[model samples]
Target: AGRLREMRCELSFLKADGSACFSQGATCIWASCNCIHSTLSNAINLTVHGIQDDGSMGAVAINGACFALLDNGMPFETVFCGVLIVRVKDELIIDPTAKQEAASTGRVLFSVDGHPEVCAMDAIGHWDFIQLEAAWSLAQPSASAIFDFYKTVMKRKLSV
Candidate 1:
């Protein structure tokens, strides 16, 4: 096995039990959507303790919430994954370190579906239409890996 110190993962992922994530009230942030008729709703509560952020938590939270929702058997039309792209000078980096993240001129967090479609996007700093278009292109395929990652996670979770 590779040593932990030598492990340089381009994308960082996190997952946890859904036990108490749902079933909360008052202190939760309620996000609701009107879908055709009626509504869809969920309670989101965030707590951060002891750890410093590396400028990628938004992407992480979206992915984490999606994973948790999946575990809870929520019936969503289509599933999506999040990706963070940081433009450093002339290059675009995925899931950069704190230093790399800070040095970038453009930062974007995109959530997309399996078919290269953008479900949501949040970008920071500044950019051109060319870079915006390029980032979307980059984000779609880069985001594809998480579904593959999720597939394996589900497999292991079910097999065990």
Candidate 2:
């Protein structure tokens, strides 16, 4: 319970129907989603607040938004999780800070679900195909962990 509280989240963080607030070290993001009134409409509007210098923020917010929608009992085809990978020289850093991001030669922000397919990918700086592939490979496992964490949190919340 204490650990879950540390990762604060509410179904209505904003005025939107579904919302989530997520923090990763110094990076904090608030994401919300609103469903339109029309049942015939599949309109899902997502709003993200906070820093937008990099795609990592968007990735985190989008992922959080998905969870918030699920918490609100919204139907979805699938759920996804995001990860940030930074290439510093030959090394690939996972979830690098803003300072680390500035020092990196390349950065990749990606999201994936339970499937092998990548839902979204954004990259910055110079990177070869091999480097991008390696970064994507690194992101998949990290994203899996995030998805698992979400499941654990939801399970605990429901049981209580």
Candidate 3:
């Protein structure tokens, strides 16, 4: 009778609500690709992020065959050249230089987001006080837990 009651209790735990308290399955694959090494031999390996004429995001592979001559070893300087193909938009403007990216109107969105501190802090010591406070807070037990998990799991460390 006791065994029967235990069986019934176990059966009740397995409800049909599609809710399981434990993980059923998981998969993980780690791959490392060295593009810088491959580029020397002119063997281009690329991955396209999406396939749309114009979406919020798009990615295309710029083949290395003309990369050197197109931009003179400066991919970020030729805004409209070496774009390869438009994957997610009918027409897309590409910024190929630091100067172009800096002067772009699109970057105004970041400025409007109140991230001027991050934008203006290219040099060191400008926010020494903020850095000090951040470092000090990391020493606390609550904040240290976050670091501990990162160090233990991601970095494979037993202790901080």
Relative to the true structure, how large is the alpha-carbon lDDT of every model?
0.47, 0.56, 0.19
lDDT of 1 by residue, 54-127 (tens): 34444454454554555555534456766666666776665555545464566666656245567676667766
Instruction: Give one digit per residue, the lDDT tens place, for model 2 in 1-160.
Output: 0011123344443546666666544455666661011111123523556543333444455566666676676654466665656667766656554545564656566655245456666677866787787765657766666667777767765677
What order do you get sorting by TM-score, best first? 2, 1, 3
Using lDDT, give the best candidate's number.
2
Clashes of 1: 0
Candidate 3, 1-160: lDDT as tens digits: 0000000000013322211111101111111111122122212212111122221110112122222222222232222111111111222222222222332222111000211121111112223333333322212322223223222332321133
Candidate 1 Cα errors over 4 Å, as ranges: 1-52
**Which candidate, 1 or 2, would have the higher lDDT against the true structure?**
2
Candidate 2 clashes: the total is 0
Q: What is the lDDT of residue 150 in candidate 2?
A: 75
In candidate 2, the residue pairs with backbone N, CA or C atoms under 3 Å apart (3 or more residues apart, or in different chains) clash, namely none
Could you tell me the lDDT of residue 107 within candidate 2? 59
Q: Which 10-residue span in candidate 1 carries the lowest summed lDDT?
A: 31-40
Worst 10 residues of 2 by lDDT: 34-43
In model 3, pairs of residues that clash are: 52-88, 53-88, 53-89, 54-88, 54-89, 76-96, 76-97, 77-96
How close is every model to the real structure, measured as TM-score? 0.63, 0.71, 0.15
